[PDB]
Structure formats: structure tokens, C-alpha cells
Write an enzyme that holds these catalytic residues in place. Sequence first.
Site, PDB file in Angstrom:
ATOM      1  N   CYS A 256       1.926  -4.461  -2.367  1.00 45.62           N
ATOM      2  CA  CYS A 256       1.380  -5.274  -1.206  1.00 45.62           C
ATOM      3  C   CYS A 256      -0.071  -4.673  -1.235  1.00 45.62           C
ATOM      4  O   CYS A 256      -0.417  -3.576  -1.161  1.00 45.62           O
ATOM      5  CB  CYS A 256       1.907  -5.173  -0.153  1.00 45.62           C
TER       6      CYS A 256
ATOM      7  N   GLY B 203       5.477  -1.462  -3.527  1.00 46.80           N
ATOM      8  CA  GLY B 203       4.257  -0.787  -3.098  1.00 46.80           C
ATOM      9  C   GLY B 203       3.011  -1.677  -3.758  1.00 46.80           C
ATOM     10  O   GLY B 203       2.022  -1.140  -3.266  1.00 46.80           O
TER      11      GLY B 203
ATOM     12  N   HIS C 231       1.156  -6.581   8.002  1.00 43.43           N
ATOM     13  CA  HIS C 231       2.664  -6.051   7.920  1.00 43.43           C
ATOM     14  C   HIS C 231       2.793  -4.392   7.559  1.00 43.43           C
ATOM     15  O   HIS C 231       3.812  -3.928   7.873  1.00 43.43           O
ATOM     16  CB  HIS C 231       3.828  -6.813   7.222  1.00 43.43           C
TER      17      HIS C 231
END
Lengths: 303, 303
Positions: free
Chosen positions: B145, B143, B41
Site C-alpha cells: 500500500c 506492505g 488507512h
Amino acid sequence: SGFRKMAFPSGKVEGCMVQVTCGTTTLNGLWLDDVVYCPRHVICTSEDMLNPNYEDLLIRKSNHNFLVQAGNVQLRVIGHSMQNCVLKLKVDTANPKTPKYKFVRIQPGQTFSVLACYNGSPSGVYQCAMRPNFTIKGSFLNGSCGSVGFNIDYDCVSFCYMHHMELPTGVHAGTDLEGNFYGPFVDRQTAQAAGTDTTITVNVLAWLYAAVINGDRWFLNRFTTTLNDFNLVAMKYNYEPLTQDHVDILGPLSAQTGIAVLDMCASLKELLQNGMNGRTILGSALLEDEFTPFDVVRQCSGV
Amino acid sequence: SGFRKMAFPSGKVEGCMVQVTCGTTTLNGLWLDDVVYCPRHVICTSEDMLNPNYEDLLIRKSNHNFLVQAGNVQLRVIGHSMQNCVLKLKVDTANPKTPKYKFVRIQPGQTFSVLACYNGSPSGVYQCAMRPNFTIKGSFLNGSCGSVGFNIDYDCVSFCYMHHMELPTGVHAGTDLEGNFYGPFVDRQTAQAAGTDTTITVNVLAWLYAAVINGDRWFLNRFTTTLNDFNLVAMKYNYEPLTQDHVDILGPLSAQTGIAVLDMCASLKELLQNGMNGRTILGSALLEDEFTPFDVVRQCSGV
Ligand SMILES: *[C@](O)(C(=O)NCc1ccccc1)[C@H](C[C@@H]1CCCNC1=O)NC(=O)[C@H](CC1CCCCC1)NC(=O)c1cc2ccccc2o1
Ligand SMILES: *[C@](O)(C(=O)NCc1ccccc1)[C@H](C[C@@H]1CCCNC1=O)NC(=O)[C@H](CC1CCCCC1)NC(=O)c1cc2ccccc2o1
């Protein structure tokens, strides 16, 4: 969101761990530039721990009595000295992995990460607080002496603890990196024991703010308290007195949540008086005191 | 002695963290050999999260749409592909700090260390368990991820989790390093929520053995139970059923403490039925289920 007992990343400290051997005693040392730091009781035998005179024991040693191993590589010792309860072994090679670092002596109530190590090899990392009674509730087995505690701030490692011994209650005692013990303890076998401990009030309040930031609000109330009535109940529950400096420290968390510090103290008073009645805060059924205000801010709104 | 929620030393994983940017989206990636792994993503915009077709979005990108930063050094992307929910960016430089590693898909109830990271920079390390409902109770902000979970076994890092999102209860969901989600979750914005969770029974029993190893014994009793009567009460308290395999796993801890597994189950039954009555075990007022039997053995009698 979420709130965990989080330790600092340990890589900068891992690159500094080594093994020190003197006679039949082996423990961990910390290799920074061309110096290796370790507990001076590495020079002790089984017969000497009762009442050792370390000046005597050390004057009877030479550089070649110390075997320093960094990974597979042997480091040659080219000088040695004592500073309080730590031995400093000057080696012929500067650690290429030395981080930016400093040595700090911390105050009770401050937190730090411990890198548990055995035979120079890191085993695990965990967070803990210096207790008001100058002990730490660690996890240490035979061979862990010389393991260090530290904080990191923008790539600078501030070392603040070196492990030396275990007290009869199963808690732990040690020194700053300049070899001065925290608390009254000495590096010999005596009747020494942890004194009575207290709960770190400013930290509990920080953690209640962490809970609010994370959506646990059930413990709040409409009440306020004065600092002195609060400190009256804190004394009653074996909590440290809260100072105006503590209140000032908690200011940013107060401002972010809109909850005045003395209002949060009224919540803590109610929790002390009534218990939690089967509820939890941030997944704990006890009031948590191992998070400083700075820990909360770092974890809840930072990187 | 002592017993802490201990994470693995994080240095081997720290040397692999990088920053990946596509358009205005930046997150963390894992740089092993000449490949960088990150959540697919990263190729999503604000407009696409509802129902993205990642095959479409990706076919519209080229190598130069991906900026990989390792410290201060930019890494040039020379190939890209998708594997389930992870993007693999082949770069022109092999990470010199690649540890011995593997990718493992873990079972619920297994524990692992998370290295929280922001903009490719590690922030903290903590231990957690894969819950029976395939979520983890982490500590993750915007942030994070691409932050990974891992175990270490004799200098081999087994990576088992990559962070992707936060669910409405504040718990976390993600993938193995081959991009397959744990649980039923998908990488799009939908009504998905954590299912009902249960307590990891075999882990609670492991931790009660840790307590005995460490001198908390107050919860023991003279009773025994059969596996089926125990599982009857466990069902009642939303605990996972205990299997014979679990009993076999707990064998070494049973042997070291002299407490048969079914006797420890009788203690757990009593604790479930009666509560703890104002007492604590290993400093907790709740029954702890984030320690596997292997975690206990490693921490209590090993290095
Ligand atoms: C520490 O010295 C260490 O790790 N040494 C390396 C080593 C390797 C194998 C066996 C023993 C030691 C050790 C750390 C302790 C060990 C016990 C479990 N948890 C710990 O943190 N520290 C000690 O053993 C100190 C040694 C003293 C020697 C003289 C100078 C001051 C320290 N002793 C104790 O911790 C301790 C506990 C205890 C209980 C009863 C009687 C004596 C006693 O000593
Ligand atoms: C993760 O994507 C991340 O860190 N991205 C980098 C970044 C930098 C700045 C701002 C935002 C993101 C992020 C991690 C989340 C963030 C929120 C707090 N804790 C976390 O773990 N993940 C998300 O934001 C995902 C994004 C989805 C995009 C489409 C593919 C699947 C993931 N969303 C959520 O976590 C989330 C929570 C929530 C609540 C209400 C409405 C939407 C919503 O999304």
C-alpha cells in the site's frame, strides 16, 4: 496476489547512461567510476561494417575523437582501449552516481531487465530472458546500441548485457559487459541468423507454480511422471531437457505448494499434449517461459 | 523492431519513496517537496477496518504519532492533514530528489507504470492499464500500500495512482494522488467487488497496428466495416464501444501503416468471430488491450 512481467527498478542504471559520439556515429555508453563502456562499433563508418578490422580502426583514433556527454555535461576522454567487442573510454571524472556493481556473464534461460536508451537518455524498462539460442526478444530501434541489461540484488547492480544488433528475424544480439557476444554472432554485417530456439522448460514449470500460488489450478492432475518420460515428450515439443539440477532448483516452490516437481511435470506433459482448450493461465493463452524459479519466489512471496 | 510491455524508467519515482509508520501499521509514502503522501488507512488498527470514521481517528493523533523514514534518515513530521482518502504529512525537510511532477486523474483505458514498493524500498516496475471497471490487474503483496502509478513526459512525472487494497478476484483498487478512489470502492472492509469488465477496443486496435509496424500481417483482410456494424459485434464480445474520437486518435498509426481505421476494425471483427486458429500476434495468443495508441507510437517509432 497477481503476477506481472516485472522489471527491476531502473534508477541505479539510469544514473549511468551517457552518449558516445565518434565521427557521425552516436550510441549509448555506461559510465561507471571513471570508465565509459560502449560497443566498439561506434568507431565504424558506413563503409567499414562489412568486414572491419577494429584494431586498425582504433589505432587510427585519439582520445579527442570521442565525445562523451552525460546529461548536459561533456566528459573529457583521457584514455581508450578495446576489450573484445567493447570500447573502454577512461574519462577525467568518476561518475558520482556509480552504484555498487559487477559484471556477470549469464547462462541461457536467465532473465534480466533491459533499460532501453537513446542518445544517453532512458526510454523504457522491460524484462526478458536470454533465449537458448543466445538471442533476446527485445524492443530496440536505431540508436539503442549500448543499452544494457541487468539484475539487482540488494543494491548491487549485476550488468549482464550490452546491445549491439538486430538479426533478420527481428530478435536481438549483444555482448556481456566485457564485450564477449552471447552465441556465435560477430560485430560485422554477414549472413548470421538466429539458430533454432527451444522453450525454457524449468521456467515454464516455475510459472505453473506461480499460477498455483495465485489460485490457477485447473491444469493440475492426479498423475506423476518420471524425469525420462517427461524429457521424451519435451524433446518432442522443442522444450529444453529438464535436469536434476532444475528439479533441485524448483524445490522451494514445490515445498511451498505441496506439488512435487515430477507431478507438475505431468501437468506440463498434459498441457503440451492437449493444449489449453480455450483457457488461460495467469492471463496468458500460451505457456510462459520468461520467469525463472528465482523470479517467481521474489515476486510471489517477497519484497 | 520488437514490441514489449514496457514501463517508464522508474528512477525519478524511486527517489521519492519513503516508509510511513503509525502504531503497528507500516506502508509506503511518496515524498515530494516537503510533503509525504500516503493512504489514510495507515491510521487504522485491526479493530477499525470494518467501519472506520477517519475524521475521528485522525483528530486523536498528533505529529509525533507518525514515523517517516527515508532510507536511513528519519524525517520529522511537522503537520498532518487528510484530503479524501490520502494523508498528507508535512515534514521539516524538502526532498532534494523531487522531480518535476504533477498529479493527474486518468480515464479508464489509460496505461501507467507501477513501482511496487515495500517498507519504502522499490521492488519492481511494471506496466498496466486502468480497466473499464476501475480496477487494475497488478502484482501486490502485504506492505505494498502506498506504492504509486505514474507516466513520464519529458522529465515530468505525472502521478496517477496510489495503491490501497486487493479485491476478492485478486485485482487491485486505489486512488489518485488526491485520494479519490477510481471506481465505487471505499477504504473499509465491506462486500465490495469488481464489476463486470470489458476489453479496451481502441487499445486492441493500437496493438494490431503495432503488429503491422513490426511485420505481423496475417490477420489483415480486404474487408471494411462501418463503425456501427463494428460496434454491434464489439457489444457482442464484451468490447467497449469505439467512438469517432477513438478513430481520430488512431489516425497517425493508420497514416503510418496505410491501413484505414475501419479496415483494421474489419480485421478485429474477423479475429473476434474466428479466433486466431493457433497463430500468435506479437508473441500473444490473446488480443492485447494494455497498450494505448500513444504507447504504440512511443515504442515503435520513438525515443
Ligand atoms: C546500433 O548500432 C545503434 O543503435 N547505432 C546507433 C544508430 C543511430 C542511428 C541509426 C543507426 C544506428 C544498431 C541497433 C539496431 C538498429 C536497427 C534496429 N534495431 C537494432 O537493434 N545496430 C546496428 O545497426 C547493427 C550495426 C552493425 C555495424 C557493424 C558492427 C555490428 C553491428 N546492424 C544491425 O542491427 C542490422 C540489421 C540489418 C538488416 C539488414 C542489413 C544490415 C543490418 O544491420
Ligand atoms: C495495504 O493496506 C498494505 O500493504 N498495508 C501494509 C501491510 C503490511 C503487512 C500486512 C498487511 C498490510 C494492503 C495491500 C493488500 C494486502 C493484501 C495483498 N495485496 C494488497 O494489495 N491493503 C489491505 O490490506 C486492505 C486494508 C484495508 C484496511 C481498511 C481501509 C481499506 C483497506 N485490505 C485488503 O486488501 C483486503 C483483502 C481482503 C480479503 C478478505 C478479507 C479482508 C481483506 O482485505
